[PDB]
């Protein structure tokens, strides 16, 4: 009659706290359930509903990263003593009066600052982060190199993965695999272009929560990477200014060589081929017309410039040569360096990145784009796209678009013709 079975392959959509598996800023020594191997259990005739924009895993990844980032800086040097009037000449070489280890004497010291880190007071400058936030110097021992982590379900939970390849980020998926842990995802911080992570299997896929709503970010996942060579050519030296009892400020000392602009080198042909595929897909998603790429109009750095974390330095690149193009040999993108970084759109906090002593060279992979549409009535048969959005959850949403977390509910009842003796 009523018979109970235990261990049935039944699940419900649910959220749960996830844990990860794999000195670094994202710890990684605590995230040491150590990854064995994936199980990839393919479920015959199982369909499921996925929605990358309602994915709780994205919200947890964002929360874990910010709490780790802040936890790692908790014991680091505060730079409060630097919010004094600076006497700046020429990047600027600035001097100031700072209390020394014995707090009755004051030293006159020198340090450089990049122009983007200082603001005129009205040669009289202050650090920009003296009226809105408390500036903390990151400890020189902390690596900012992304190390992939894998999100793992607790024992009573499982992660379903969508293997449809051309999945649009929302709706039914008819090829579902069950795993305990996700692929490794590098917590890369970037804007405008998506770096590293993972490429599409076949075609460039353009996803959007809604293509007619210009307030939503269009996420473009490439099926081929573009390699970018970023350099900060100056031959630096590091200087250390005591600011207290066992505490010091790391700054840049005299430049050994000549001053040269930071820049990134992208192959022109590779970029053109990348755009042709993007254009073909936008043409399919909208309604033929032409595609115009253009420059972002936000004006200010951080909003309109591409950003990278390269060796620990923060680059802002003027990616206009990549988008000033209408569709029916290298490109050199100049970059600026900034030391005071509001990573994550936080209020009341700021980080000072210590300078790096040597020459910096990075090689990164462009694996995607974050684009927005130019709204308004179209007056021709064209649509205009610009780099945009900038919400960091969009970066993580892209990497996690394939996963859903479900709760296993192994106990249940089914009919028969049975009675206990």
């Amino acid at each position: 009659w009523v018979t109970v079975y235990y261990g049935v392959p039944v699940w419900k959509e649910a959220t749960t706290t996830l844990f990860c598996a794999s000195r670094n800023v994202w710890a990684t020594h605590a995230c040491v359930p150590t990854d064995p191997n994936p199980q990839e259990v393919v479920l015959e005739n199982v369909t499921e509903n996925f929605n990358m924009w309602r994915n709780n895993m994205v919200e947890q990844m964002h929360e874990d990263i910010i709490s780790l980032w802040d936890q790692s800086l908790k014991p680091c040097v505060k730079l409060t003593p630097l919010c004094v009037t600076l006497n700046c000449s020429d990047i600027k070489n600035c001097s100031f009066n700072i209390t020394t280890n014995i707090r009755d004497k004051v030293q006159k010291v020198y340090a450089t600052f990049y122009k983007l880190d200082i603001v005129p007071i009205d040669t009289n400058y202050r650090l920009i982060s003296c009226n809105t936030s408390v500036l903390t110097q990151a400890c020189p021992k902390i690596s900012f190199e992304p190390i992939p982590i894998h999100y793992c379900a607790p024992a009573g939970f499982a992660i379903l993965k969508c293997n449809n390849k051309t999945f649009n980020g929302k709706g039914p998926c008819t090829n579902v695999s069950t795993v305990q842990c996700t692929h490794g995802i590098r917590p890369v911080v970037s804007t405008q272009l998506l770096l590293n992570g993972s490429l599409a299997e076949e075609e460039v896929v353009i996803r959007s929560e809604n293509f007619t709503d210009n307030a939503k970010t269009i996420i473009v996942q490439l099926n081929e990477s573009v390699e970018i060579n970023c350099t900060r050519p100056n031959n630096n030296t590091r200087r250390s200014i005591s600011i207290g009892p066992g505490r010091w400020f790391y700054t840049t000392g005299e430049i050994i060589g000549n001053i040269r602009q930071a820049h990134c080198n992208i192959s022109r042909a590779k970029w053109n081929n990348t755009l042709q595929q993007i254009v073909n897909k936008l043409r399919e998603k909208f309604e033929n017309k032409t595609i115009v790429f253009n420059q972002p109009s936000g004006g200010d750095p951080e909003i309109v410039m591409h950003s990278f974390n390269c060796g620990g330095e923060f680059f802002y690149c003027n990616t206009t040569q990549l988008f000033n193009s209408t569709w029916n040999n290298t490109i050199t993108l100049p970059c600026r360096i900034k030391q005071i970084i509001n990573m994550w759109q936080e209020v009341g906090k700021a980080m000072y990145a210590p300078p790096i002593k040597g020459q910096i060279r990075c090689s990164s992979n462009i694996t995607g784009l974050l684009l927005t549409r130019d709204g308004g009535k179209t007056t021709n048969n064209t649509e205009i796209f610009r780099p945009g959005g900038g919400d960091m959850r969009d970066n993580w949403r892209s990497e996690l678009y394939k996963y859903k977390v479900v709760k296993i509910e192994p106990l249940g009842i089914a009919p028969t013709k049975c009675k206990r003796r």
Partner: antibody, heavy 123, light 101 residues
């Protein structure tokens, strides 16, 4: 709610700085701050929006994209509209309004509107 | 523009009667409706085609008919003889008005 800058008169070619602001509780729950224009005798025209988190912007047409700078201040819980190159055709009441975080497909809808700043451009 | 044409332009109604306001789109996104009085900012009535904003009575409702979206105002009160507009994302319609018969 949504406190706004007062009205005034500008000569053609002048710039105007229109602003609005709110409480921490409202600003923190807003995804976008929109600006909407209403010329005397006309209906409503959308000008543009500013994301409160990233500072990203968008516009109703090139006639605004090339003249109107839209910004936000996340420490002060304010927003601004700087209109350069004012002409007589820009006489209108200018409203700020907010869009709460919403999912795609729900459409745009603005629960809260400011009172409207009146800008007159005249010789 | 060919999107969000509204009609009737002017509706001469008696108090207690029902207004019928139509907005036709060139595309299908959900429609949003507002009420306006001279000297005042508009008030949100309906959004996502049929949902109502807090503070809005059950006099106000709406629905979808393909690309046609409508707003119904029943048991109309004197306070409802206002200007109304439809919105579809970035566009607003011309607007219509209700007046006392």
């Amino acid at each position: 709610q949504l406190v706004q800058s007062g009205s005034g008169v500008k000569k053609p070619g002048a710039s105007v700085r229109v602003s609005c602001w709110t409480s921490e509780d409202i600003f923190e729950r807003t995804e976008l701050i929109h600006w909407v224009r209403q010329a005397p005798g006309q209906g409503l025209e959308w000008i543009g929006w500013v994301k409160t988190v990233t500072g990203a912007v968008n516009f109703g047409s090139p006639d605004f994209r090339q003249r109107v700078s839209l910004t936000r201040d996340r420490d002060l819980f304010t927003a601004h509209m700087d209109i350069r190159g004012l002409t007589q055709g820009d006489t209108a009441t200018y409203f700020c309004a907010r869009q709460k975080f919403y999912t795609g497909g729900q459409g745009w809808y603005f629960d809260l509107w400011g009172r409207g700043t009146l800008i007159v451009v005249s010789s | 523009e060919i999107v969000l044409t509204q009609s009737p332009g002017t509706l001469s109604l008696s108090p207690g009667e029902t207004a019928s306001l139509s907005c036709t789109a060139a595309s299908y996104g959900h429609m949003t409706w507002y009420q306006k009085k001279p000297g005042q900012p508009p008030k949100l009535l309906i959004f996502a085609t049929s949902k109502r904003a807090s503070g809005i009575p059950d006099r106000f409702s709406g629905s979808q008919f393909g690309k046609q979206y409508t707003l119904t105002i029943t048991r109309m009160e004197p306070e409802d003889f206002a200007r109304y507009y439809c919105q579809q994302l970035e566009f607003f319609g011309q607007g219509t008005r209700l007046e006392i018969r």
